[PDB]
Structure 1
Amino acid sequence: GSHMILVTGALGQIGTELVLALQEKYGNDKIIASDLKEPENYHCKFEKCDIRDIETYERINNENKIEIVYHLAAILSAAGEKNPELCHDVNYNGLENVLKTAKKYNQKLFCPSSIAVFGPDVPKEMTPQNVELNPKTVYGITKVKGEELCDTYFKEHGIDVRGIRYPGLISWKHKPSGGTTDYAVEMYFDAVESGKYECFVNRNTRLPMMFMDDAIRATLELMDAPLDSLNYHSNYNLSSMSFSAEELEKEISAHVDFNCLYKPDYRQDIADTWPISINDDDARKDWGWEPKFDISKMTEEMITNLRRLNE
């Protein structure tokens, strides 16, 4: 086959790093990036597209002989509370476009979910894989519907679509976009840049978090697993860390001097409805998941690179 891979949402937090990992794994000639606007200074072949534009999306897939899509395009939780209609449109109708195309062209898919599928009616601690999904955000609802649609494509249409309920992801290669979990990223950036941070959640806010290298590795490992080994498809729980905002402040302060003030905003109301930690036994059992970055190791990577960038 062509062995060609498309990454939608390629310019975002995950995509910035996933494109590189896929180029190194498969060879640079095998990877096509797509997002809304063509970037200036960019070492991957790029095809612009709105994920809602089925005609152009199909054309990109056809012409490039795409066999595998890593579908990252989305509107996230905080933006989705501000703009519910946009969130539904982009997330649900974009996903539907991706799945319909996969069925036409016999594609394999990665379509991620989020811990935002969970609401406060199920356990906050070590949330199980199989509990009711009654999210309290628009975004969470889109993700629940998306899990279900993916699993319908798998069962009814034979599409090998896989996905992870990512926790909050922390990275330094992309500027923070002010998402709900972005207080962890921003705290690092602002600590190193200015020695001060105004945190938009309260000091005890405690969410499942993961360093990007772990999330990217998890994504690739899940995609490489034999299909018959998977007991879940669109929606693996996935865990690494669970810490509060002040715990992160104390970790960062062991390395860098900084003033952290807590001034919650609307994003608190999102975070408060999510679990603190996640039971990912099924990922660990079915496909060998184990995280490699604890808070100390992640902190060293973040601070070292951010200090370099601030030279």
Structure 2
Amino acid sequence: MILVTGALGQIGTELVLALQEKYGNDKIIASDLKEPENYHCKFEKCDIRDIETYERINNENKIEIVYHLAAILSAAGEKNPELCHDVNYNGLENVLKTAKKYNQKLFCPSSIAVFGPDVPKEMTPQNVELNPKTVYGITKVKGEELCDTYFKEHGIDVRGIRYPGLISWKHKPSGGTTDYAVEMYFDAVESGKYECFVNRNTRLPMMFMDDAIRATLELMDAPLDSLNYHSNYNLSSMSFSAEELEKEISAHVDFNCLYKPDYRQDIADTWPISINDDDARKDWGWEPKFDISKMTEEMITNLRRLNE
């Protein structure tokens, strides 16, 4: 029995379906703040900070494995730092405390946001000092440390990935900083114009959702004794600037992109351009399959369909 928190967000939208297909619909429970409709999966509403309800859901459904995706993201968290700490840190602590009680296995993702400007910007190593300059990054570092304490001190099998910016078409993201890449696709197809909230040179690690979902499932399936890292694997696929994405998209559809930076520039400026993920590659056989042009094909084909 598997529970997915944050089930209705960008990752959860695709992860729930992937898990239902791998394990059976009889095995999957979804959860988020507000009940949706026309929803195929079994669903239980819960605020991640409400420990009594969270625990009830886990024991009533006999949850043995939790994929914990509930969070406030970088840009929303910069504007509301108190809420970002509360949901991200106290929410995770709730998940980990419950995992200890019920002897659960966990997937608790981190982020490239753990890194700050003091470390190498290209091919950032696994083990560098973590000095993030965002509220959200700070919560992710504290979360990595808390997760690794539950593994070492309490024997909880908790695994996680420092995801790069994730690009998908099934669910448009809306509180982050890497969001411009998805927004640029949606707006290019829907209206042939986009106003980008970072400058044209902003260069960040990116990954297509298929790859991110597959990595998550592969890492969860690995034998525990093959892993040299737990909460916080580096993971890599692509790196490009905003104008480089604009150009890739322009080879498929007419659009004009205007660049109008806001506060989210300050967030992105503090992050790396690319990530060394050799440990994932070595420990559990990670390789990405989607480069920029394959990703672009998938995005445009599916967005054109959805706009017919």
- For the aligned pair, the TM-score class normalised by the smaller chain equals over 0.9
> Whole-Å Cα distance in 2 between the matches of residues 44 and 267 of structure 1?
35
Shift of residue 178 of structure 1? 4.7
Gaps of at least 5 residues in structure 2 are none
What SS is found at the alignment partner of 1:79?
A: helix
CA contact under 8 A between 2:73 and 2:175: conserved in structure 1?
A: no
Deviation at 1:179, TM superposition (A): 1.6
Runs of 4+ in 1 over 2 A off after TM superposition: none
Give the aligned partner of residue 302 of structure 1.
Answer: 299
Using the TM superposition, give the Cα deviation of residue 43 of structure 1 relative to its aligned residue in structure 2, in angstroms.
0.4
* CA distance in 2: counterparts of 1:177 and 1:44, whole angstroms: 23
* Residue deviations 1:57-115 (CA, integer Å, cap 9, x gap): 00000000000000000000000000000000000000000000000000000000000
Deviation readout 1:22-69 (Å, 9 max, x if unpaired): 000000110000000000110000000000000000000000000000
1:184, 1:143 → 2: CA distance?
Answer: 22
Alignment deviations for residues 249-299 of structure 1 (CA, whole Å, 9 cap, x no partner): 000000000010000000000000000000000000000000000000000
Q: What do the CA deviations read for 1:136-169 (whole angstroms, capped 9, x no partner)?
A: 0000000000000000000000000000000000
- SS across alignment from 2:67: strand
Does the 8 Å CA contact 2:202/2:241 hold for their aligned counterparts? yes
The alpha-carbon deviation at position 175 of structure 1 amounts to 2.0
Q: Which range moves more in the overlay, 175-184 or 193-202?
A: 175-184
Separation in structure 2 between the aligned mates of residue 187 and residue 286 of structure 1, nearest angstrom: 35
The answer to whether the Cα contact below 8 Å between 2:72 and 2:175 also exists between their aligned partners in 1 is: no
Counterpart secondary structure, 1:14:
helix
Cα distance in 2 between the residues matched to 1:176 and 1:213: 16
1:82 aligns with 2:79: yes
Paired with 1:245 and 1:304, the residues of 2 have a C-alpha distance of 20
TM-score by length of 1: 0.99
Whether the 8 Å contact between 2:92 and 2:143 is mirrored in structure 1 is: yes
Counterpart position of 2:120: 123
> Using the alignment, how far apart are the partners of 1:176 and 1:234 within structure 2?
23
Query: Once the two structures are superposed, what CA deviation does each residue of 1:204-249 show, in whole Å capped at 9, x if it has no partner?
Result: 0000000000000000000000000000000000000000000000
User: What SS does the aligned partner of 1:47 have?
Assistant: strand
Q: Percent identity between the aligned chains?
A: 100
Whether 1:97 and 2:94 are equivalent positions in the alignment is yes
Relative distance call for 1:101 and 1:178 in structure 2 (3 A) is closer
Residue 68 (1) aligns with residue 65 (2): yes
Q: What is the CA–CA distance in structure 1 between the aligned matches of 2:175 and 2:113, rounded to whole Å?
A: 16
In structure 1, distance between residues paired with 2:118 and 2:112: 14
Retained in 1: the 8 A contact 2:74–2:175? no
Aligned mates of 2:37, 2:227 — CA distance in 1: 40
Q: Is 2:9–2:173's contact at 8 Å kept on the other side of the alignment?
A: no
Counterpart-to-counterpart distance in 2, 1:40 and 1:125: 44
For 2:175 and 2:280, the matched residues in 1 are separated by: 29
Cα deviation digits, residues 159-196 of structure 1 (max 9, x gap):
00000000000000002315200000000000000000
Measured in 1, the distance between the counterparts of 2:153 and 2:16 equals 30
Quote the Cα distance in structure 1 between the aligned partners of 2:57 and 2:228. 32
Distance, in Å, in 1 between the alignment partners of 2:66 and 2:37 is 23
CA distance in 2, matches of 1:198, 1:277: 25
Q: What residue in structure 1 maps to residue 267 of structure 2?
A: 270
Secondary structure of the 2:64 match is strand
Give 3-state SS (helix, strand or coil) of 2:206's partner. strand
Contact conserved, 2:204 with 2:274, CA < 8 A, in 1? yes
**Do residues 147 (structure 1) and 144 (structure 2) align?**
yes
Distance in 2, Cα, partners of 1:178 & 1:38: 20
In structure 2, what is the equivalent of residue 52 of structure 1?
A: 49
1:283 match: secondary structure = helix
Partner of 1:190, secondary structure, is helix
